[PDB]
Design an enzyme around this catalytic site. Structure first.
Site, PDB file in Angstrom:
ATOM      1  N   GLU A  96      16.449   2.288  16.517  1.00 52.41           N
ATOM      2  CA  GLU A  96      15.648   2.835  17.621  1.00 52.41           C
ATOM      3  C   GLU A  96      14.152   2.847  17.318  1.00 52.41           C
ATOM      4  O   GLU A  96      13.330   2.719  18.229  1.00 52.41           O
ATOM      5  CB  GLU A  96      16.093   4.252  17.981  1.00 52.41           C
ATOM      6  CG  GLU A  96      17.330   4.328  18.851  1.00 52.41           C
ATOM      7  CD  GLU A  96      18.627   4.278  18.066  1.00 52.41           C
ATOM      8  OE1 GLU A  96      18.593   4.222  16.817  1.00 52.41           O
ATOM      9  OE2 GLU A  96      19.689   4.302  18.715  1.00 52.41           O
TER      10      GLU A  96
ATOM     11  N   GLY B 141      -0.868   5.558  10.279  1.00 56.13           N
ATOM     12  CA  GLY B 141      -0.778   4.777   9.048  1.00 56.13           C
ATOM     13  C   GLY B 141       0.611   4.748   8.441  1.00 56.13           C
ATOM     14  O   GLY B 141       0.762   4.815   7.218  1.00 56.13           O
TER      15      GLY B 141
ATOM     16  N   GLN C 169      26.007  14.773  20.440  1.00 56.37           N
ATOM     17  CA  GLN C 169      24.641  14.305  20.730  1.00 56.37           C
ATOM     18  C   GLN C 169      23.790  15.245  21.594  1.00 56.37           C
ATOM     19  O   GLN C 169      22.680  14.893  22.003  1.00 56.37           O
ATOM     20  CB  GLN C 169      24.660  12.883  21.307  1.00 56.37           C
ATOM     21  CG  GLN C 169      25.189  11.845  20.335  1.00 56.37           C
ATOM     22  CD  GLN C 169      25.412  10.501  20.979  1.00 56.37           C
ATOM     23  OE1 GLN C 169      24.476   9.723  21.167  1.00 56.37           O
ATOM     24  NE2 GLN C 169      26.663  10.211  21.313  1.00 56.37           N
TER      25      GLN C 169
ATOM     26  N   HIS D  20      25.555   7.293  26.883  1.00 56.36           N
ATOM     27  CA  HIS D  20      24.758   8.204  27.695  1.00 56.36           C
ATOM     28  C   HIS D  20      23.770   7.463  28.595  1.00 56.36           C
ATOM     29  O   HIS D  20      23.417   7.952  29.669  1.00 56.36           O
ATOM     30  CB  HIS D  20      24.013   9.197  26.798  1.00 56.36           C
ATOM     31  CG  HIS D  20      24.914  10.117  26.033  1.00 56.36           C
ATOM     32  ND1 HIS D  20      25.728   9.682  25.010  1.00 56.36           N
ATOM     33  CD2 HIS D  20      25.120  11.450  26.137  1.00 56.36           C
ATOM     34  CE1 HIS D  20      26.402  10.707  24.521  1.00 56.36           C
ATOM     35  NE2 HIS D  20      26.051  11.792  25.186  1.00 56.36           N
TER      36      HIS D  20
HETATM   37  C1  D7K Z   1      -3.782   7.462   1.128  1.00 50.39           C
HETATM   38  O1  D7K Z   1      -2.416   7.672   1.405  1.00 50.39           O
HETATM   39  P1  D7K Z   1      -1.247   6.686   0.712  1.00 50.39           P
HETATM   40  O2  D7K Z   1       0.070   7.566   0.341  1.00 50.39           O
HETATM   41  O3  D7K Z   1      -1.817   5.925  -0.440  1.00 50.39           O
HETATM   42  C2  D7K Z   1      -0.608   5.595   2.126  1.00 50.39           C
HETATM   43  O4  D7K Z   1      -0.206   6.539   3.123  1.00 50.39           O
HETATM   44  C3  D7K Z   1      -1.744   4.647   2.629  1.00 50.39           C
HETATM   45  C4  D7K Z   1      -2.825   4.102   1.630  1.00 50.39           C
HETATM   46  C5  D7K Z   1      -3.955   3.176   2.086  1.00 50.39           C
HETATM   47  C6  D7K Z   1      -4.027   2.759   3.564  1.00 50.39           C
HETATM   48  C7  D7K Z   1      -2.938   3.282   4.512  1.00 50.39           C
HETATM   49  C8  D7K Z   1      -1.788   4.215   4.100  1.00 50.39           C
HETATM   50  C9  D7K Z   1       0.570   4.654   1.747  1.00 50.39           C
HETATM   51  S1  D7K Z   1       0.317   2.997   1.103  1.00 50.39           S
HETATM   52  C10 D7K Z   1       1.875   2.743   0.587  1.00 50.39           C
HETATM   53  C11 D7K Z   1       2.376   1.481  -0.140  1.00 50.39           C
HETATM   54  C12 D7K Z   1       2.641   0.346   0.821  1.00 50.39           C
HETATM   55  O5  D7K Z   1       3.330  -0.628   0.069  1.00 50.39           O
HETATM   56  P2  D7K Z   1       3.428  -2.179   0.605  1.00 50.39           P
HETATM   57  O6  D7K Z   1       4.231  -3.029  -0.533  1.00 50.39           O
HETATM   58  O7  D7K Z   1       4.021  -2.094   1.939  1.00 50.39           O
HETATM   59  O8  D7K Z   1       1.964  -2.788   0.773  1.00 50.39           O
HETATM   60  P3  D7K Z   1       0.895  -2.933  -0.403  1.00 50.39           P
HETATM   61  O9  D7K Z   1      -0.072  -1.809  -0.537  1.00 50.39           O
HETATM   62  O10 D7K Z   1       1.646  -3.178  -1.859  1.00 50.39           O
HETATM   63  O11 D7K Z   1      -0.006  -4.246   0.007  1.00 50.39           O
HETATM   64  C13 D7K Z   1       2.768   3.981   0.851  1.00 50.39           C
HETATM   65  C14 D7K Z   1       4.231   4.100   0.437  1.00 50.39           C
HETATM   66  N1  D7K Z   1       1.971   5.132   1.537  1.00 50.39           N
HETATM   67  C15 D7K Z   1       2.535   6.414   1.906  1.00 50.39           C
HETATM   68  C16 D7K Z   1       3.497   6.234   3.068  1.00 50.39           C
HETATM   69  C17 D7K Z   1       4.918   6.561   2.880  1.00 50.39           C
HETATM   70  N2  D7K Z   1       5.818   6.438   3.990  1.00 50.39           N
HETATM   71  C18 D7K Z   1       5.378   6.027   5.350  1.00 50.39           C
HETATM   72  C19 D7K Z   1       6.378   5.899   6.471  1.00 50.39           C
HETATM   73  N3  D7K Z   1       3.955   5.736   5.512  1.00 50.39           N
HETATM   74  C20 D7K Z   1       3.036   5.843   4.398  1.00 50.39           C
HETATM   75  N4  D7K Z   1       1.637   5.584   4.612  1.00 50.39           N
HETATM   76  C1  D7K Z   2      30.075   8.526  23.353  1.00 51.89           C
HETATM   77  O1  D7K Z   2      28.756   8.131  23.055  1.00 51.89           O
HETATM   78  P1  D7K Z   2      28.408   6.642  22.339  1.00 51.89           P
HETATM   79  O2  D7K Z   2      26.975   6.021  22.819  1.00 51.89           O
HETATM   80  O3  D7K Z   2      29.506   5.690  22.620  1.00 51.89           O
HETATM   81  C2  D7K Z   2      28.154   6.941  20.495  1.00 51.89           C
HETATM   82  O4  D7K Z   2      27.078   7.872  20.422  1.00 51.89           O
HETATM   83  C3  D7K Z   2      29.465   7.479  19.815  1.00 51.89           C
HETATM   84  C4  D7K Z   2      29.394   8.514  18.649  1.00 51.89           C
HETATM   85  C5  D7K Z   2      30.657   9.059  17.980  1.00 51.89           C
HETATM   86  C6  D7K Z   2      32.055   8.574  18.445  1.00 51.89           C
HETATM   87  C7  D7K Z   2      32.153   7.557  19.595  1.00 51.89           C
HETATM   88  C8  D7K Z   2      30.868   7.008  20.268  1.00 51.89           C
HETATM   89  C9  D7K Z   2      27.747   5.622  19.777  1.00 51.89           C
HETATM   90  S1  D7K Z   2      28.991   4.617  19.038  1.00 51.89           S
HETATM   91  C10 D7K Z   2      28.086   3.268  18.713  1.00 51.89           C
HETATM   92  C11 D7K Z   2      28.613   1.994  18.041  1.00 51.89           C
HETATM   93  C12 D7K Z   2      28.660   2.102  16.520  1.00 51.89           C
HETATM   94  O5  D7K Z   2      28.912   0.791  16.102  1.00 51.89           O
HETATM   95  P2  D7K Z   2      29.338   0.486  14.551  1.00 51.89           P
HETATM   96  O6  D7K Z   2      29.209  -1.130  14.262  1.00 51.89           O
HETATM   97  O7  D7K Z   2      28.504   1.102  13.487  1.00 51.89           O
HETATM   98  O8  D7K Z   2      30.829   1.134  14.370  1.00 51.89           O
HETATM   99  P3  D7K Z   2      32.107   0.700  15.326  1.00 51.89           P
HETATM  100  O9  D7K Z   2      32.244   1.640  16.474  1.00 51.89           O
HETATM  101  O10 D7K Z   2      31.778  -0.809  15.929  1.00 51.89           O
HETATM  102  O11 D7K Z   2      33.363   0.815  14.255  1.00 51.89           O
HETATM  103  C13 D7K Z   2      26.611   3.481  19.206  1.00 51.89           C
HETATM  104  C14 D7K Z   2      25.473   2.462  19.076  1.00 51.89           C
HETATM  105  N1  D7K Z   2      26.423   4.881  19.855  1.00 51.89           N
HETATM  106  C15 D7K Z   2      25.154   5.358  20.404  1.00 51.89           C
HETATM  107  C16 D7K Z   2      24.123   5.624  19.305  1.00 51.89           C
HETATM  108  C17 D7K Z   2      22.831   4.887  19.298  1.00 51.89           C
HETATM  109  N2  D7K Z   2      21.868   5.214  18.242  1.00 51.89           N
HETATM  110  C18 D7K Z   2      22.140   6.267  17.203  1.00 51.89           C
HETATM  111  C19 D7K Z   2      21.156   6.595  16.092  1.00 51.89           C
HETATM  112  N3  D7K Z   2      23.427   6.978  17.238  1.00 51.89           N
HETATM  113  C20 D7K Z   2      24.390   6.676  18.262  1.00 51.89           C
HETATM  114  N4  D7K Z   2      25.605   7.423  18.231  1.00 51.89           N
END
Ligand code: D7K
Ligand code: D7K
Ligand code: D7K
Ligand code: D7K
Ligand code: CA
Ligand code: CA
Ligand code: CA
Lengths: 554, 554, 554
Positions: free
Chosen positions: B49, B418, B112, B28
């Site tokens: 991404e 965070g 998509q 696309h």
């Molecule tokens: C107070 O909220 P908390 O839940 O404790 C948390 O959000 C947090 C805690 C203190 C500072 C900043 C964020 C934190 S801290 C935390 C553990 C990080 O583990 P890591 O091993 O990366 O570092 P460390 O603390 O052991 O040095 C998680 C999983 N979370 C929840 C969380 C889950 N998934 C994603 C994408 N982001 C997040 N923040």
């Molecule tokens: C026609 O559109 P295309 O761009 O070619 C694509 O979307 C697609 C999907 C289904 C069938 C054929 C192509 C595809 S196919 C494709 C390659 C996948 O590579 P992969 O190594 O996993 O398997 P293979 O094709 O090499 O066996 C990508 C990166 N995209 C775009 C894309 C990017 N990021 C995410 C999260 N999802 C996606 N689908």
């Protein structure tokens, strides 16, 4: 010691300096009504929430201040949506306070709940938010006000659940913040201001174009100082027009619309300084018909998106328009070495006169009263002590032809929304603001547009607001009928005719003075009589439909 | 003569001055990939991404410029959502370019398509929009960029349909606009500036606190001129820290967290000038623990909502932070001699030193390597030629205690979102920006956080980016495990332990250098070796879990 | 006596019959973690919220039940957005439980708050809602479950503020409702069912096409009864394929894709009965290539929008697919007067064989292992005791060629989102459901796709889930590279190559068994060995890139 959440709203609004609210009662928002009663804060209750919302806009636009609308849950909010959308595109600072279903009994299919009011307003507000705790009211209301009042100005929706408003808390524990937001907007960097003034100095045909943001801040003494020092002719869109009223006659270019004929006379501006004016409907989009492509454009706007959005520009400054005008005046106060440009100021005035004199020669009231002749009668009464509110379609397009040679205290016309019927509410709120400043409000509307809020004559009478409502009755939805005739065919007219109804009779039934006129002389007397009385008035004016305004074709 | 819609995107991007893109390929968005190939504009393709989006953020933050993320329709967009939300709350200028289903075959349940991507991004972007015509591309791309770069900085989503991108138009029919947006931000009114300075001169214990917007504009010489002339000590949140690196030592307070112990020492700041720093997580919300309730607060922010959000302020100015700093330096260069303030600056230094010394005395690496001791090893390698990226809760809370004494070229830590795991992508993009600046990027992360984007070691190897990834391995989601132990109980740990996996083995499998260490001596050696090579590296550091960082408790 | 809001969630989920949850820990959602510990309810904690969200989908799809995802505030939610979008288009019943910022300290710029998570999920959920009171938890959770489980199935977002979850209330006052929702879906009016059966009786070449809704209800005994009575060949899209596994061999048309060659052999279906299958990507949109334009179409779908959206249909019934299959079986159990159609059932099987035999003759592993030969090795191990999860692009397009002749216990492939990388999480959750039913899960993914969630090998090992991950390594993003070669040119390949990384080495570093193979024989042994062990396994398979699958061109 224990006070309601609605009490917290009003105490915060008072500290913010609001003296009037516009709304329609609901039990969901009664705590605000009760608190306003205690504090002697007037709520102008209307007959429609839309009218109340538009009234808040008009008050804000005419007063150059914050307007506050107050609507109830459910239908209260949804009826206020057009005003919100209008204020959004017009850039007008309005705090829309709305009730909603109590947070307790969420998802219970109860009265006036089940509608996500925040989500509906999110696309048309600077900030839309629902209050989750009674203790948060003062800080969130003040946050909402700061958002609405800052550049670019716009509507804010603050949603107040019945729960949150009825809730009582200890008044000694919750702090009411002050409005601490500077009245002087941000100004351009000295280098940008120098570059702007350097381009303005070497320009052969410079022109200033004012937008809505110039009206919101209303730096009139600073504007005059800058214009007197440089001698640059000033144009403005509908919303910027009232800012020209304090300028000398030779400097007044009027409305931007008559910059159209400048290309033909080889007088197309060399430089154009856009202050708050955006590229769009009012400035001829990116066609080059008003703002030339060959011209160097200096654009100042608080929104970077607007900086040359439809056309290439030479300089784009993100700053407050009021702060910029202030800065331009301050810098030019010590300069005192600017070119004369008296001949260029004479040319812009002559070209504006050329337009007006051409329309006058083509206009005749031999059979029926010509819309342009009707517009002239009003124009004769327009000065700094008068706010003109314009609705209708052909009605406002004809009226714009006489507006650029008078000096209104205010001119509130359609913005980008172009929504027919908004004028009644707008004018009602404008009159409330005009009562403070000792001005008179005149609404010039169409027979179609007036039907939207015709019940507001009741509000005019109940609240004793001396608004004069002039209806330009061409027995139809005019501009749309004109589109059917011109774009499709003379025999292709349907749904655009309105050959029924005594509008002055309706107004009289609501207790307001009702005039009906069908000639220049009768309209002149009725208008003079309406001005002489301290009463709400309706002047139903029989006006010709056939004439085509130049702005319709363009 | 005939060029693709993707070509129009790229030609506008080049004219804007962008030199790097971050993305993941999709059919696309192939027309953009092909256009970048022709113009030798490198697209750093990632393994996720999210990492590409975070990389664009890191490039924007480290290089103080526009980051550009480039993702495909459907899953490409949805995988970029966390980067968008992160850029939203952190105020980072990132252009998110996304593909979508063709405008033709709309509502056909095709690949998509079928998800409203603009609606999904609308709550977390400054602007989100879908292009309707190939002709509109250049002006819309430029508009999106103007929106991203203007104060307050933030992300913009530009939805580009496959239909629109594949379409071919005559190159001479649509013009590519220049980026006509002033690099100088708007500055305060002279009167507001004079009141701020008047308060600053009268203050006995004045303090400056910098936020993210100070880093985006990077007016370092102006800041240095203003600080040296006034002699006022300067603090910063995580994002503002690198702006302290050019400042004289005696005027450096370090991170804002250091203000905590000032109340106990009767040294709570008398006045605080907040530049881009918002009331929130980093400044202790409205608790008054860092920004005291008794202090007079001058707050400068481009967003009016932020002005006294959680705490009453003395003076609220809406302006650009960089423009303000430039205005402050300009005003303080030509005014009267400011008071010495030498003893107050010494008090600030000593209190920051006493915190650092108090932690060092309580830190012990007997039995297991202490996080603070591990943080010190990194600190000895941090200067102006180093950008430090921090992730992983307890990891960054400990690392922050060593960051005030050093002067990093960049310090990119968690913002309000965070979100654990963002660090890898962020550091990847920061390294691209550091490569043209001649700097080295070091990522300090947790064992949990690194797992989110552990596949980016491949990208490091493929693109030859010499990022050093330091993993503080306490074999758990550390801070969350602490929460369970402190707030619930010792036998209440669940879903927080990660007692598995050789992360140095993972990196080696992708071709990166893999170190495993468990002491001061071994970690010092591994980091020294990694710094000596022009290669991507992974240092798995076995670290103690039990120690509680001061910042966790508060 | 006093219990937390998180306790109310878990007690309600238990009454709803949920036995597994999929998530990633946060302090915001710890009360749910603590309550699950007390009630012995397993939470499969992953290394990414996306993987956890996809795992909930896989569990739901493989188990034909409700899947429950549990994510934290901020980044927890935003990382779960791809799973939500995927479940939305795939019509899979998943309850997404998310934390958010406490309702108190709303608008305080605090950690993990400031994001409108409901608004972000509103375009991609059947219902997105934020809980406003602790007392509302049980009824709103049950309401959310009713929404997800009803036709058409889909994701629901229930937002639970930290405030609402930590809040403690009297357990004796708040009632926990039962799940009172009929397991038997609504069935067509007898007249519509008669009209459908009357068209099916006079049809010369009738065909049944099953969609995702046929899999969700899984009325297998009713399906067999209807098929044995009528003798109509049954086709199905990816999601409907596992429903064919209980049918006799002569009745199995397989995947709808091989209905393409029917027009050429003049065997284009006379009648097509679509049960849950929509007009879109899987059924060849409205092109007529799979579902002919000349054919009379009977479409049954719970969504009226889908009823003939891309093509004219003869009969459109809004009803539940499971209820319809039940109704079709019930009516035909007493009929016993149906035409033979043995010749037509032989023709559909021969045409499917014609396709498979044609591909086999063109496939060669003389230099490198052909993707089709690699697909055959897997196919040999596929029966009712195996769930096949398909990711990648060329990978799944090649695999689909061998799937229509085997009888999988489950087949979970890409839906409309087509998001690369979703397969790992999907398969992980599927394996949890397969452990209940005594089945084995096999993920067939691409080398590109596997990098999205490659850290989940850790989760496989920690939780001891014997998932077999087969990576079809063609050293690139294959289908996108193929698009660059075919649609642009052989020399126009950029950003699509991935010539780095030992994926089995990564898996081994996480503690899982790592195989690497580059031939039929070695792959056969590795797969047999992986099946023999009760351990997580990775099989890195070196596979040719050049071959073009027929489904890619179509
Ligand atoms: C107070 O909220 P908390 O839940 O404790 C948390 O959000 C947090 C805690 C203190 C500072 C900043 C964020 C934190 S801290 C935390 C553990 C990080 O583990 P890591 O091993 O990366 O570092 P460390 O603390 O052991 O040095 C998680 C999983 N979370 C929840 C969380 C889950 N998934 C994603 C994408 N982001 C997040 N923040
Ligand atoms: C026609 O559109 P295309 O761009 O070619 C694509 O979307 C697609 C999907 C289904 C069938 C054929 C192509 C595809 S196919 C494709 C390659 C996948 O590579 P992969 O190594 O996993 O398997 P293979 O094709 O090499 O066996 C990508 C990166 N995209 C775009 C894309 C990017 N990021 C995410 C999260 N999802 C996606 N689908
Ligand atoms: C409990 O909530 P209440 O505020 O009392 C109200 O909403 C209501 C009261 C009882 C039943 C139904 C609605 C009502 S009842 C009510 C008065 C209606 O006056 P009307 O003269 O029409 O009839 P009546 O009651 O005198 O017989 C108003 C203004 N509101 C609030 C309201 C405002 N604007 C719009 C567009 N819809 C609304 N419902
Ligand atoms: C070019 O588009 P048009 O459709 O012609 C119209 O939108 C318009 C607006 C500004 C100038 C010229 C025409 C107009 S002009 C118009 C007729 C207004 O009739 P009115 O009697 O009030 O004044 P006049 O034109 O006869 O003097 C209508 C109904 N509309 C559509 C419309 C419908 N409902 C609402 C709330 N707002 C609207 N603007
Ligand atoms: Ca009219
Ligand atoms: Ca850690
Ligand atoms: Ca592959």
């Amino acid at each position: 010691a224990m006070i309601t959440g609605g009490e917290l709203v009003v105490r915060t609004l008072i500290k913010a300096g609001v003296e009037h609210l516009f709304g329609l009662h609901g039990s969901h928002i009664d705590t605000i009504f009760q608190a306003c009663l205690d504090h002697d804060v007037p709520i102008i209750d209307t007959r429609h929430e839309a009218a109340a919302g538009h009234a808040a806009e008009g008050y804000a636009r005419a007063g150059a201040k914050l307007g506050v609308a107050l609507v109830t849950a459910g239908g209260g909010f949804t009826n206020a949506v057009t005003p919100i959308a209008n204020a959004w595109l017009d850039r007008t600072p309005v705090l829309f306070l709305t009730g909603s279903g109590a947070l307790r009994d969420d998802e219970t299919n109860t009265l006036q709940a089940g509608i996500d009011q925040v989500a509906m307003a999110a696309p048309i507000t600077k900030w839309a938010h629902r209050v989750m705790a009674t203790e948060h009211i003062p800080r969130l209301v003040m946050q909402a006000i700061r958002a609405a009042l800052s550049a670019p100005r716009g509507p804010v929706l603050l949603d107040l659940p019945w729960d949150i408003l009825m809730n009582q808390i200890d008044e000694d524990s919750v702090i009411i913040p002050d409005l601490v937001l500077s009245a002087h907007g941000a100004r351009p960097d000295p280098a940008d201001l120098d570059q702007a003034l350097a381009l303005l100095r070497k320009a052969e045909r410079p022109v200033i174009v004012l937008g809505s943001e110039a009206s919101r801040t209303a730096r009139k003494t600073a504007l005059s100082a800058f214009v007197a020092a440089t001698g640059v002719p000033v144009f403005a869109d509908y919303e910027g027009l009232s800012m020209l009223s304090g300028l000398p006659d030779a400097m007044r270019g009027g409305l931007v619309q008559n910059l159209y004929s400048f290309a033909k006379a080889d007088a197309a501006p060399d430089l154009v300084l856009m202050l708050g004016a955006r590229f769009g409907l009012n400035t001829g989009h990116g066609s080059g018909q008003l703002i030339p492509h060959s011209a160097q454009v200096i654009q100042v706007d608080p929104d970077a998106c607007e900086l040359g959005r439809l056309q290439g520009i030479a300089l784009g400054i993100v700053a407050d328009v009021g702060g910029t005008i202030e800065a331009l005046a301050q810098a030019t106060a010590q300069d005192a070495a600017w070119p004369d440009r008296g001949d260029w100021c004479a040319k812009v005035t002559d070209l504006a006169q050329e337009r007006y004199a051409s329309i006058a020669a083509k206009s005749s009231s031999e059979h029926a009263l010509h819309p342009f002749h009707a517009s002239q009668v009003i124009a004769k009464h327009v000065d700094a002590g008068v706010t003109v509110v314009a609705d209708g379609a052909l009605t406002y397009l004809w009226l714009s032809e006489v507006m650029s040679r008078v000096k209104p205290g205010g001119f509130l016309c359609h913005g980008y929304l172009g929504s027919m019927g908004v004028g009644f509410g707008t004018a009602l709120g404008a009159q409330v603001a005009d009562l403070e400043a000792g001005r008179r409000t005149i609404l010039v509307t169409g027979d179609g547009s007036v039907g939207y809020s015709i019940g507001e004559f009741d509000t005019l009478v109940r609240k004793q607001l001396p608004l004069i409502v002039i209806i330009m009755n061409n027995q139809s939805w005019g501009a749309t009928l004109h589109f059917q005739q011109l774009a499709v065919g003379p025999n292709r007219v349907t749904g655009t005719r309105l050959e029924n109804g005594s509008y002055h009779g309706v107004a009289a039934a609501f207790g307001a003075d009702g005039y009906h006129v069908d000639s220049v002389e009768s309209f002149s007397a009725a208008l003079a009589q309406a001005l002489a009385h301290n009463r709400p008035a309706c002047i139903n004016v029989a006006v010709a439909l056939d004439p085509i305004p130049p702005e319709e074709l363009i």
